[PDB]
Amino acid sequence: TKVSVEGVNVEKFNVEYFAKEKLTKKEKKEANLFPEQQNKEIKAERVEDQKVVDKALIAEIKKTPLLKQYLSASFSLKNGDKPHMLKF
Amino acid sequence: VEPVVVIDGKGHLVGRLASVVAKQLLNGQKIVVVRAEELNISGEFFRNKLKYHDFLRFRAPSRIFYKALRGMVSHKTARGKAALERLKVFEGIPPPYDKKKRVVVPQALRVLRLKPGRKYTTLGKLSTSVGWKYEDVVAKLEAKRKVSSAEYYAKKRAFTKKVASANATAAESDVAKQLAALGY
């Protein structure tokens, strides 16, 4: 099952975009031996990229019937499911 | 595919069914073998009677089939003992297994393996002929079971007839045609 990627301008972000960040000053001496946990949040730019891709992707999805609910539901293997026979 | 496999013994051969079950217990499949008295032996009654005789120099059919099965498994090993501990064998079908489906093993069927025009042997008659004095008790319970099972099946057929009527009136709908489009 296929959808059109053409609505989305994906090309901007790259391999370097997913590079996990680093620290400096040896984590600023661990804030002088006192740990701090505010760094858990996501950068907003990642969220904005997700929204920009998501709009043009949902616009593709809504033309096809039942595909949103297909992506929402997960997948498992039932009894008698034989994946060598199961054409996908 | 099933946790506990319930196997009817009516119309089956001794050794072929014993080989199949002995393989599956060493494979780890839990097996109850029911209506054991209706197992069938190749050859006439008299040959097999002499075979039990010269072996004997336990009378229940379950003990007989258990003997045959235990011969095929390496019984002295701990693994073989666990495999035998997986097994249950019963003459007739006692509860709770009366309310569940009983499968058959086609490669051990009498009517498929035996050529027509051959004598076979009923295990219950053999056991009674060698001193198992309980066969009349068996058929008495089995008659009551067949009565209640005929009642159950008569109810089941009427209810599934109602289900057939409901599926018939559910037909011609567009959701049914979309299932037809998908194949169901």
């Binding site: - | 489906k101 499968v103 498929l112 393996r113």
Partner: protein, 171 residues
Amino acid sequence: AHFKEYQVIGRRLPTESVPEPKLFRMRIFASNEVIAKSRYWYFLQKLHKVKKASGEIVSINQINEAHPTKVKNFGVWVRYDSRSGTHNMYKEIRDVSRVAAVETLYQDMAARHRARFRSIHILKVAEIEKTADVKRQYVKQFLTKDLKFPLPHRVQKSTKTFSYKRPSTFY
């Protein structure tokens, strides 16, 4: 294995002052050409005093069936050795092709007579053309008008472990 017809010709060697001997032709049923040539020499020595060093093979050939669609009827002459004594035997075979009839004949001779492929010496396979020249009763059993019968062996290979159906030879 599955055999093949072979036109095999031998001409035992034109010597000095003997040009062009008589080009002896036979037809061998064999799985390959090699054992066909070996059987050809094995008959040619029994024909007269040749050796494989004495002569040569002219032409090894496979020959197909002209009409492998029609069921033909055959009368076959065989000689072979019930080891001490020999005797001929005449069998009648209903078969589509010649070489399949010879295949089934070897299977039947090995079944009923314990005879090997080397012990069996084919004399002649020829089509019986018209009916009632079928001397054997069992091929004549299939020469009746409008012949119908049920299948024996309704037992088939079930290919699975357990059956929910309690199956039946329902034929």
